[PDB]
Amino acid sequence: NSQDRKDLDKFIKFFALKTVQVIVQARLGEKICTRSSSSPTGSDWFNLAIKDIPEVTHEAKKALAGQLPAVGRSMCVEISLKTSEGDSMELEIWCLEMNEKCDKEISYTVYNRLSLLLKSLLAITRVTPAYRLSRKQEYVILYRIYFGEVQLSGLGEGFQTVRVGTVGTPVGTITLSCAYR
Amino acid sequence: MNCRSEVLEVSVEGRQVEEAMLAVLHTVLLHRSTGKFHYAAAGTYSIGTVGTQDVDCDFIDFTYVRVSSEELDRALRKVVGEFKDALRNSGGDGLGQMSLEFYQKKKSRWPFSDECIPWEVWTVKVHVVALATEQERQICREKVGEKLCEKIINIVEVMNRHEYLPKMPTQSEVDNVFDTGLRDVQPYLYKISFQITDALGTSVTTTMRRL
């Protein structure tokens, strides 16, 4: 391939892993706090300080199994609530899709857009009902990553969708959104 | 690069004026900033890393994310404090608003000083309500948080529908696009002002037709 393609596949891979990390990280029940740095490291993806947790990295790499989102093939992070009685109910289906339409006019602009999209993700994850719920933990919150084939009927009738945002790239445009109860 | 404007509106108790404002500004400023640029003589530059943190509100049932710069936070808390002082001492009107405007600096030939061109402005209008009971207080702490949720949502959604941003500067142009005075963050050149307004009425025409 052309260098843009390796750089882009890498960018989408680490954007997806960082997305899983931010979504799961906004449901532990405690506050997240990272420090800015003018002398960065080689591991501050998207110029954001997002500390990976190895377990979530492992579940995300196993769900992705070493491939990228594409047409009809979207990465999903499902957040559910399990009570003492055992009732399981999905609360959120976060969806990372890859649309068909390519952007020919558009290397680092996509990188910058994905950084912005991660900042939007940070913001949106806290203004969902499941956030206030996850901060007060009785019950326990659960996460699960999969690579569908996305379907939402586990969120019952009448769920609303928040579109975190989209980013056009020459292989396709990425859409990040959340379907919640 | 004609300017784009967005108008938000919120109804809160006086106690929660600051946090509410802090929630909106910081949200916008999280999208309208990046890491500090360090330029090399060759013209390239490296970009530093932005931290973010959670802010639990004490007078609202709400949490928001802000850049981890404490200079920026102290600045915005100060101008919002000016807004709260003016609002309290304005008395009966209680109709205040704050504007956060992003602009570029464009060099003019002498003697004209450089012209500041807005490319995007955010105005949020504050409606302050007086509470009598402790119960109204407790319900207000919840409902205001629920409203700020949809405020942040709409800020993000609009942030995607705005396709224009200034183009990356060179080492000499940087201070015409970015505020480079902070240690932990590099905001776009911004400007926060506020304004106390007198409330006006509503026309009757189509409301007749509706009746």
PDB file of C-alpha atoms in Angstrom, chain A residues 5 20 30-31 34 36 39 49 55 60 76 81 85 92 98 111 116 119 126 133 151 156 158 164 171-172 177:
ATOM      1  CA  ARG A   5      -2.647   3.746   4.095  1.00  0.00           C
ATOM      2  CA  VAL A  20     -12.897   1.677  24.031  1.00  0.00           C
ATOM      3  CA  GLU A  30     -14.523   7.368  39.852  1.00  0.00           C
ATOM      4  CA  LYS A  31     -13.248  10.541  38.230  1.00  0.00           C
ATOM      5  CA  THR A  34      -4.728  13.197  33.302  1.00  0.00           C
ATOM      6  CA  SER A  36      -0.984  17.927  30.114  1.00  0.00           C
ATOM      7  CA  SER A  39       7.466  17.429  26.608  1.00  0.00           C
ATOM      8  CA  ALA A  49      -3.274  11.771  27.677  1.00  0.00           C
ATOM      9  CA  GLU A  55      -7.296  -5.685  30.375  1.00  0.00           C
ATOM     10  CA  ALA A  60     -10.521  -4.728  22.503  1.00  0.00           C
ATOM     11  CA  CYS A  76     -19.460  -1.839  19.493  1.00  0.00           C
ATOM     12  CA  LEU A  81     -26.331  -3.067  34.464  1.00  0.00           C
ATOM     13  CA  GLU A  85     -31.367 -10.428  41.427  1.00  0.00           C
ATOM     14  CA  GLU A  92     -25.628   1.866  26.143  1.00  0.00           C
ATOM     15  CA  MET A  98     -17.077   2.998   8.980  1.00  0.00           C
ATOM     16  CA  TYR A 111      -5.306  12.505  12.817  1.00  0.00           C
ATOM     17  CA  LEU A 116     -11.168  16.188  18.256  1.00  0.00           C
ATOM     18  CA  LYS A 119     -12.435  14.977  22.913  1.00  0.00           C
ATOM     19  CA  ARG A 126     -20.403  12.125  30.980  1.00  0.00           C
ATOM     20  CA  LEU A 133     -25.649   5.869  37.169  1.00  0.00           C
ATOM     21  CA  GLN A 151     -28.233  -4.454  16.677  1.00  0.00           C
ATOM     22  CA  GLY A 156     -35.947  -1.846  24.024  1.00  0.00           C
ATOM     23  CA  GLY A 158     -37.794   4.156  22.135  1.00  0.00           C
ATOM     24  CA  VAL A 164     -20.633  11.860  19.005  1.00  0.00           C
ATOM     25  CA  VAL A 171     -10.995   4.953   2.839  1.00  0.00           C
ATOM     26  CA  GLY A 172     -14.337   6.073   4.295  1.00  0.00           C
ATOM     27  CA  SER A 177     -22.481   7.449  18.168  1.00  0.00           C
TER      28      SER A 177
END
